[PDB]
Design a protein around this ligand. Structure first.
Ligand code: FE
Ligand code: FE
Lengths: 385, 510, 159, 385, 73
């Protein structure tokens, strides 16, 4: 009922009690955190050292052992959860400097613009110029089937969210997982929108699910996703094999080079709107993943050859599994109308060259991996009809 | 074609969320557990990522505009009574670590689930706990800029590791949420941690803060409180999902009782001590608040609601009610005796506070007020006296022990609550236990409880060296962050502590 | 701290994978569990263990091959065989005390970098599942005196 | 220095002075405004009756004459500024209920999403698949030339902003003008972006300006815009001839049916992003213009045949001037690569049929205008090469 | 192609704002006046519509949060 700001008696008592001078001169919050940039930022101040870690985990400030542990003696957090080693697990910085408030701000802006655009597009009647075969078969079936790839890559983050050894890495992983699930939900939203525009269009997931689980074209995709989801436990390996190898090749090809490019040669004005959101999410996640796995782990002062050894082995294995997935997927070009420079063998060859060269420059040169782009292109094109 | 303006709402997208999962052989949980979750469990809130972000941004803008514009114009940062100003240093920093570990707890629950809607709810909970961590950090961030003593708000994350009160906090809100079976952590975090203690506390802290002249904490906490109902729903859905499993009828009540005892053993003393002994204007006695929180609201309503699924009231509730009358006074005595090891400034109860204590707790005078008056007469607050309360307690035959499981201090000769001292020797080491439930926990799973207390870590070391190595000094490098008074003059320095010559003994040396 | 420095000085002399395996197994058997042989390194052994784990990881990546790093244990034996043998041994344990001894010994002997991370985590989860299912049955049936007798503890004071 | 909330003495004095009971029971702000919807909204409360108008202007509440007037006796606001008549100038309601705060909120969200999308698109290297001829000639020249059409339609609102007789109509007109200028600036932003991506691309306005002022293809466009800008003074006539006739036919064709559609058959992934913003703005403005000119003026209880007479005359004149502009513009199809169903005579015929039928249903049926779509299509196609 | 992250800032768009006008005969003011305005007059703030909206929204959120939440409490 009574407050200490507005009550005259309590305000007078508090004013009498409060000292007339400051008792300390340092007013910066957590001044002892080392800044990555010129000055300490709010993201670092609110983020770093929130996880209480003893001194036997690198970079920790506490002491002693955990108060409670698993049955049998497993620690709450330990060094046994990953193969890679470092002198400090508190070194990772997100390039975009995202904590909760700016993140939700950006996603809210995107969600309100999406609704406005859908209302205007529905009012304007732009669906009439779309190619009937493309919309009826290719989009409705295979674009819907890509949903489960997105969902599996999303579910791969459950163990990373629990076993991670830092507090900035936890935020980065959580945001990446939320981006993947948002991509899946956006694909389903586009299918539902097209179902209310065009009569006879089915937005149910039965046919896309049957394609995902049974059709040969995606046979090589499922496999890879499955081993990344329920096949490994090391959180660093999950992050690397999911975002830096498999996605950056197969998902980049399927999203950018088949669906977005062929929409713009078949007169589709709706798909690029969602594909742009997918690509923006991919680039934002790529910045953080590249920072973590190149600046901190592969370029460690003490370790780094050890980490490079493990990273090269992982890259070999999962690049083989991504090349298998791509060679399997490339058989979809027999179901589309032929367009010179895009659908014939030359267009696919240049598309694969672009994807593999971009991946080379982005990751392989920085890690130390040796790749021959021509061999990969021929290996994938061996499955061309 | 139809040319009417349409869009897609979240409930239409959420309708298809169940069918996003596909069955393959190795689609199982990665963690050890005793239960299996039901495949057809649904979610009560129809939330997707974009709707979640929209709602959270709407909340955050309203929260931040007030603090950054209006309360700053009013100069409300330096209009809070000092005692609450030092109480908030402990409160906000201790709530932050629990919010942080809830992140990993919810991530492990999402790992364990099998339905897609249950996974969506757990993901939303993870995001909410990240938000709550950042808000709790922002409270101390604001006090560091606008309060008249920023020493304790500056570096709590580094300087909280010196004192004895921090270890019990890590057990109930850091290691009790992430270590063990996934359902055990679920019932530790949602059915007991949030439904029974945290949610009532966030409402009581605001009323105490507004009574003592603080308007930042109400601003942050009233917005924090708006997210928890979804977490209570998550806990109810987790209990409903395991009901049809045969294991439930074998283990659920055991885990519930263990979690309840673990949580109450630390929140009964600490919250009462921080409320009653860290304020100038008293809203209400702590015993009545505890009774209405645990005994009547959670103990009755929630337990009756879940009784239809086999859940029973804990069998240790009688002991909690028995010791929920004097526990916080014993803990207050322990915290006053070891003030140099904290990171906040303290204040002994004055005449009006003593009158209130005797009015609401008959018998408080003859036991506790005599000790406080003797300490005051011997020079408790005077730097030149060189009076250390721990040395006084040791010379008078009162010894301090730390429980092996709970990590809560205990003084057997000056305690009016429940529990007795137990000293055991196993494999060549001596352990001290203070109650029956903790003794059973330690005797059943000796490998999970291997924590070090400060007596073992600091044995044979001078107090000033311990303070200086843990960065317990202020900016000038000599004054200590912790003080025995709340005045602005005659502060203690490292030389004053060095003159007393306190050396940590071994309590169990016998 | 001088204990840390002298143990680090001893650790720095390891130059073989077999030597580092023997060293880490001996250290973990001596100083790790509640059934440890000595308590003389109570406040320092978790740092020395992390030093030994870093040296053996460096030696492993400098000496072994990719197939060895992924499929074999550092002792030279197949990881899948080790996992199968130890799960078979746990499943045959009759009481909770033998079960906890088996779990503790497995953690003391085969723990990364000695065994690959994925197989170790999968085996640890299975062992923990069996241990929890075996411990939690009839939790409140035995009185405290009977529990004290069963654990084999010596009572020094009883207020 | 001293405040009345925190000073004990002043707070006590104020508490003594403040009465213990309320002196009135009506707490609704401007309760006497008649609500259009079920209940009075914040937009109506903050908007309506802000303009002080005497009783000899319909719907006004004041009395007397203006205190100061123009030299010669022109009133500050008068009935002589328009031909149309009504019983109440305070009847107009924006369907979107936009006052300043939601308006700037939406535009800010769009501006922050645009920057994020441009950064991601630049990082992703999607410009490599665009058709070289389309990008080099058609986009760079004629899309840049459309800028001046947008700018002229923007400048047409200067007199409407001063001579309008209401306060909701003023907001609607101001927001429409800001949308037009934002469209022009967005076209220039896309040109500048493509200039930093592709070497040799020129983003200067010299060639587009020369095309706008000299090229025959836009000869019929300039004319129309000029007469709408500096040829008439009646604000109702400006609004009708600018948004309901000329834009809804010529600008709709040029924006939706040529540039957005042909971008999706030539592999362009950048233009639809900006064209979507243009279309959303167009639909939002169309809602308000349709409300004003159909619900209030053409369906007046007392007048309405008078207003319909004037509106029909204006529609005849400006439809003739829009058909001239379209027939002039349709000669650009000789400069593009032939694509069946889009560039040949049949594709253009169906595009014109779509535009004219949409305009018919949207405006002509509601106003009472009689139009033959086939005659308009043939008149425009008489200029096809 | 160059694959570095770039955008366009308002000062780059504002640079070309002068050349959006074209000269025709009846390009005059509609109101009675005694003066003529100079054709080459510049502006001191480099504002376009999107930047203006961003700044105004940033101001409005701070203004409204206070009144609707804190002073009401
Ligand atoms: Fe929380
Ligand atoms: Fe919560």
């Amino acid at each position: 009922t009574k407050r200490g700001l507005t009550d005259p008696e309590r305000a007078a008592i508090i004013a009498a009690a409060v000292p007339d001078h400051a008792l300390d001169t340092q007013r910066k919050y957590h001044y002892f955190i080392q800044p990555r940039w010129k000055r300490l930022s709010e993201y670092e101040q609110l983020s770093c050292y929130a996880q209480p870690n003893p001194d036997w985990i690198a970079g920790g400030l506490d002491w002693g052992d955990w108060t409670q542990k698993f049955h049998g003696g497993r620690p709450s957090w330990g060094n046994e959860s990953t193969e890679l080693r470092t002198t400090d697990w508190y070194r990772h910085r997100d390039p975009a400097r995202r904590w909760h408030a700016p993140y939700v701000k950006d996603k809210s802006e995107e969600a309100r613009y999406t609704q406005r655009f859908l209302a205007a597009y529905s009012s304007e009647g732009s669906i009439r110029t779309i190619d009937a075969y493309w919309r009826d078969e290719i989009l409705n079936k295979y674009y819907g089937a890509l949903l489960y790839n997105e969902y599996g890559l999303f579910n791969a983050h459950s163990s990373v969210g629990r076993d991670c050894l830092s507090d900035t890495i936890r935020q980065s992983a959580t945001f990446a997982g939320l981006d993947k699930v948002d991509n899946a939900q956006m694909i389903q939203m586009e299918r539902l929108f097209i179902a209310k525009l065009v009569p006879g269009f089915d937005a149910s997931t039965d046919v896309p699910k049957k394609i995902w689980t049974t059709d040969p074209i995606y046979a090589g995709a499922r496999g890879a996703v499955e081993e990344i989801w329920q096949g490994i436990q090391d959180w660093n390996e999950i992050l690397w094999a999911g975002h830096a190898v498999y996605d950056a090749t197969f998902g980049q090809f399927a999203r950018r080079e088949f669906f977005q490019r062929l929409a713009t040669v078949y007169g589709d004005t709706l798909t690029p709107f969602f594909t742009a959101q997918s690509q923006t999410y991919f680039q934002t996640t790529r910045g953080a993943i590249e920072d973590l796995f190149v600046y901190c782990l592969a370029n460690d002062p003490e370790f780094g050859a050890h980490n490079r050894t493990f990273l090269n082995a992982w890259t070999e294995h999962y690049l083989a599994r991504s090349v298998t997935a791509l060679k399997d997927f490339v058989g979809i070009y027999a179901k589309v109308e032929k367009v010179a420079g895009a659908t014939d063998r030359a267009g696919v060859s240049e598309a694969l060259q672009r994807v593999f060269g971009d991946w080379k420059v982005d990751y392989a040169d920085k890690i130390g991996f040796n790749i021959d782009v021509d061999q990969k292109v021929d290996a994938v094109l061996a499955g061309f009809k | 074609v139809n040319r009417a303006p349409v869009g897609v709402e979240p409930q239409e997208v959420h309708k298809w969320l169940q069918s996003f999962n596909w069955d393959f052989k190795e689609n199982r949980t990665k963690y050890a557990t005793k239960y299996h979750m039901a495949n057809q469990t649904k979610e009560q809130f129809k939330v997707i990522a974009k709707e979640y972000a929209r709602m959270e941004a709407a909340k955050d803008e309203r929260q931040f505009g007030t603090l950054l514009d209006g309360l700053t114009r009013l100069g409300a940062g330096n209009k809070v009574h000092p005692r609450w100003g030092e109480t908030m240093k402990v409160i906000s920093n201790f709530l932050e670590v629990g919010e942080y570990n809830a992140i990993a707890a919810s991530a492990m629950l999402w790992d364990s689930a099998t339905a897609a809607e249950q996974k969506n709810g757990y993901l939303a909970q993870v995001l909410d706990e990240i938000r709550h961590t950042h808000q709790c950090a922002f409270i101390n961030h604001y006090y560091s800029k606008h309060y008249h003593d920023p020493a304790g708000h500056n570096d709590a994350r580094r300087t909280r590791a010196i004192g004895p009160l921090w270890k019990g906090m890590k057990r109930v809100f850091a290691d009790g949420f992430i270590s063990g079976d996934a359902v055990e952590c679920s019932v530790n975090l949602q059915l007991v941690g949030e439904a029974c203690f945290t949610n009532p506390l966030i409402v009581a802290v605001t009323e105490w803060a507004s009574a003592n002249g603080d308007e930042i904490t109400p601003t942050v906490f009233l917005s924090v409180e708006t997210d928890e109902l979804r977490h209570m729903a998550n806990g109810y859905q987790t209990v409903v999902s395991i009901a049809n499993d045969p294991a439930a009828a074998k283990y659920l009540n055991t885990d519930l009782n263990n979690a309840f005892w673990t949580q109450q053993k630390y929140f009964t003393p600490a919250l009462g001590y921080l409320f009653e002994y860290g304020s100038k204007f008293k809203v209400e006695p702590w015993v009545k608040t505890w009774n209405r929180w645990v005994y009547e609201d959670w103990g009755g309503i929630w337990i009756g609601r879940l009784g239809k699924y086999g859940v029973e009231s804990p069998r240790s509730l009688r002991d909690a009610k028995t010791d929920a009358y004097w526990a916080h006074h014993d803990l207050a005595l322990a915290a006053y005796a070891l003030w140099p090891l904290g990171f906040a400034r303290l204040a002994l109860p004055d005449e009006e506070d003593q009158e209130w204590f005797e009015a609401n707790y008959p018998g408080w005078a003859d036991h506790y007020g005599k000790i406080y008056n003797e300490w005051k007469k011997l020079g408790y607050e005077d730097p030149k006296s060189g009076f250390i309360p721990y040395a006084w307690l040791l010379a008078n035959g009162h010894d301090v022990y730390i429980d092996r499981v709970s990590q809560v201090p205990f003084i057997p000769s000056l305690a009016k609550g429940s529990g007795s001292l137990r000293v055991h020797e196993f494999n060549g080491k001596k352990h001290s236990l203070t109650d029956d439930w903790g003794e059973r926990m330690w005797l059943s799973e000796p490998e999970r409880y291997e924590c070090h207390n400060l007596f073992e870590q600091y044995e044979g070391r001078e107090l000033s060296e311990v303070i200086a190595e843990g960065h317990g000094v202020r900016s000038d490098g000599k004054t200590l962050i912790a003080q025995p008074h709340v005045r602005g003059d005659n502060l203690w320095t490292l030389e004053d502590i060095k003159r007393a010559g306190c050396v940590f003994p071994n309590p169990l040396a016998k | 701290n001088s204990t840390r420095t002298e143990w680090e000085g001893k650790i720095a002399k390891l130059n073989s994978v077999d030597q580092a395996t023997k060293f880490i197994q001996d250290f973990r058997v001596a100083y790790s569990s509640p059934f440890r042989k000595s308590y003389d390194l109570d406040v320092d052994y978790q740092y020395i263990e992390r030093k030994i784990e870093e040296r053996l990881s460096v030696l492993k990546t400098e000496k072994l091959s990719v197939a060895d790093l992924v499929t074999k244990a550092t002792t030279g034996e197949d990881a899948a065989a080790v996992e199968a043998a130890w799960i078979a041994k746990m499943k045959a344990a009759e009481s909770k005390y033998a079960a906890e001894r088996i779990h503790i010994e497995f953690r003391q002997l085969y723990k990364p970098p000695v065994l690959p991370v994925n197989v170790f985590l999968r085996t640890d989860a299975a062992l923990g599942t069996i241990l929890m299912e075996l411990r939690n049955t009839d939790y409140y049936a035995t009185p405290l005196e009977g529990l004290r007798k069963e654990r084999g503890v010596k009572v020094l004071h009883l207020q």
